[PDB]
């Protein structure tokens, strides 16, 4: 199956992070250490994503890859190059200080360019063209996902996808080519305004937004559908849908199996936070893959697949606090091998699609999820109220 | 004096961890990083030791040495090689999925062997023969230890040692040579099924169990003897004895001084835990040794000895939580130089053998232990009740 | 402007840490890792600074630079070379075990020298001479600092400076040359007892104490002046003055800008601690500088300055606990881009000199500090009571 590019996932997550429910525009930020996600941040009303990551990580930002949905300002860029980040990837549409409003906006962008010149860190654009079948593969698997088939069992998806397309190009894309060229002049991307580089960048950006709208619509705000019980209190539906699209994006990094499963872990601290996500903070993410260092990565072969929940718990940037409410979002029903790990790790809530619940396959089982105690299970369904 | 090897200590601690008081058999696990113990785990009713270590450490298992009392199954092995462990050492008697019950047990064992082929991590048997005088040295020093002499001052030890030999041979050894050969073939140890390698492995296994039964009997469940006050509530006697044997095993890594002292630090979390040890979790361990990076390691020379308690507090894998109940188990009375460190570190309880309490020797003193306030002191003695 | 060197700052901070308000003399200790301060410790009634740092850091002392205000004893030195420190710097005066009282004191010093010979770590005197204009620059800028100018608005400073010179010379310097030679004879500094090395060491020692007495007097205990509101409860005035002199010393590491700003972050844990500072523990420190790894460090150029508060929050050795009271001490009023960072980081209290509060300069503003909510602001002023 086609696999989402590893830097394209980080670019897509930063765009999705900007859409996290809550002159200067909101920015999503993905912090990546050792090519593993260690931070998912969004701008707040008071602080920018780059300044939030400095508070959250500080000197731990050393040798980290930062993926911005908007080019960071001079104040943000100086603080992260001071922290020691190596790569700063940004989505080249409109920076933090909007250029579509200003003399100050151009001045700040000009100061960013000369800060980049006099610095070791690399401020660049790391979005890649997708595989020829990648968009169609995501579009087909978004029909077949748990959350869309659940609604079907009880045409709508295509309508929902089209509205997300119009909304997301309105936010992440500059429709007017002349405005985009002026932005690329201002943010030091002069090499990308000459064809075919201008058209290639614009088509690559539109392809990534089309894929993002496809994935976001696969967990849609359709009717009263949401995550309900089937602490014990559920997350807000807008937040729960957002974290499931995160896990769904992670599910497209799977290439070792025919079906991609994605998992993301989020926790809610019992205190005020500076992040735009609020008390919500990222814990860990993972997808279905083979063990790192194994020959499979380079009886059925599925037995050695590391599941999405296992990878999320393995490469976690934060510890699970017993006092805090922690959530794991799995694109499928957690299996008989993953449920004990989730309960053992202390995760309070499970948000998953229970299409395969109670099923016993040849090499995987989903029997322990139905009879799970001590962990709140929220599944995609109509509101019981 | 004869010194226990590091791998032999780690192998013995994994066997001892399986005996931690609480088709698939229980497994003890020792996690070692940079030749320092960072985790002492045992299998629980719900999770295996390998799965527990993934929850406890996760990506921190990278380049960690894992010592299993039983060969881990395919689910455990794939997760730890995915985590990044380099060397997996197991006791070659009976794996997690018991082969003495099965087609599934053999099938899982065969799947483990081709993970070892298709992976970077090393699944080996780091078991070594003991020194010629090591067993006799341990047996002699077990007479002279504080806990045996405390009972003597108030023939029994040899009887206690003999029962542990029968019990531990029945648990960690395959007495029948034919079943042991079948296990070794099934777990990919065909090179150890031919003499003299078969006899050498079995004799070395029996030597390690005989030493383990000697050490375990030195802190015996004899009469009403235990650790009593002489938070503030004591540990369960079975747990306290187990942690003292851990420290006693660490005491045999000492070679810089004629007398070996061992210390281990354990704490109780105020929440549910997935480990087979329950809320108990390992904090740090150490023994009497010279400073690392000194000519002594490679004015009396004892004043340069780093004591067991100091080494335990130095190379601690966990921080001491003020809200938690933390315990240190010292094979002897803590000295006037270690008691301030234990109190300063915030350790709530001290379990020790106070044979030398109130004594002023040349390079060591034991006056501050008797007059210590703010720390609970539990010593080996008869129950005052 | 003249700039204080790193080793001289660490040496001066260790001497200042000895003066932290609360046979064997009190010792201040600075723990430095990767040229960043990760620990500010002082001796307590029960424990020494070297033993406290072992409790505070343990194995994290590996490859750490330890700066002592007095030469550590044999017990302290063995534990820190065992922990793995790569360099021990001490103030070449009366050591931890005072030699001005003793056969035991001389015996311990001989044991320290023998341990140093048979060990990898370097026990040295990293004291350096100051720049020719360094003392006069500090003396001039101490007139112009916020705290001295605040009192002037509401001759006194020179009198206060002279008493600190007499007090600090009596504490950190050996006035008699004969006793100082005997100390240097005993502590293995035989090469510093011959002129001009003896006179160079003594003159450099007196120069550092004169600079320290100049910085300390710039935040003096003059009349009722202190830090008052203008949790919510203020620190003790002696503690607050001490931490601001720490930040003021950090302000003299600034050379990128004509005016030096320093910031230090301290937190108070809600539990007993072994340190001589009590529940107070060091969090982070910083000064005004250009980003690390930038051409500026090796559109106005001040826009790229990393402020003292931003550097303190970036290179912090501890996290800001929401339940704890955390304090930041800034030598000047925090600017409009540092106040959001301080509030975002969760720092409860700000101690600063609000000379520039409410001022709007070309490239810096101080408008958000006056209208700050949720953070306690304590400024240098007379007691309102
Ligand atoms: Zn910004
Ligand atoms: Zn699974
Ligand atoms: Zn297993
Ligand atoms: Zn001791
Ligand atoms: Zn000392
Ligand atoms: Zn500032």
Numbering used by the authors:
A (entry chain C), B (entry chain B), C (entry chain A): 30 to 51, 84 to 162, 167 to 219, 226 to 301, 310 to 377, 390 to 476
Question: What do the study's own words say?
Answer:
Vertebrates possess a second DCTD-like protein, CDADC1 (NYD-SP15). Unlike DCTD, CDADC1 contains two CMP/dCMP-like deaminase domains (IPR002125), connected by a long (>100 residues) linker within a single polypeptide chain, resulting in CDADC1 being approximately triple the length of DCTD (e.g. 514 residues in human CDADC1 versus 178 in human DCTD). The C-terminal deaminase domain (CTD) of CDADC1 contains a potentially active HAE motif, but its N-terminal domain (NTD) appears to be naturally inactivated due to the mutation of the proton shuttle glutamate (the HAG motif instead of HAE), suggesting noncatalytic function. In this work, we provide biochemical and structural evidence that human CDADC1 deaminates dCTP and CTP.
We collected datasets of the CDADC1 E400A variant alone, in the presence of dCTP (“good” substrate), and in the presence of 5mdCTP (“bad” substrate). All three datasets were analyzed imposing either C3 (trimer) or D3 (dimer of trimers, hexamer) symmetry. CDADC1 trimers are closed rings formed by three protomers assembled in a head-to-tail orientation. The majority of the contacts are formed between Nα2 and Nα3 from the NTD of one protomer and Cα2 and Cα3 of the CTD of the other. This results in the vast interface of ~1,100 Å2 between the two adjacent protomers, according to the PISA server. In our structures, the side chain of E400 is missing, because the residue was mutated to alanine to prevent catalysis. The trimer maps in the ligand binding region and the trimer conformation suggested a ligand-free state of the trimer, irrespective of whether or not dCTP or 5mdCTP was present in the sample. There is no evidence for ligand binding in the maps of the CTD active sites, and no significant structural changes seem to occur, suggesting that trimers do not bind dCTP or 5mdCTP.
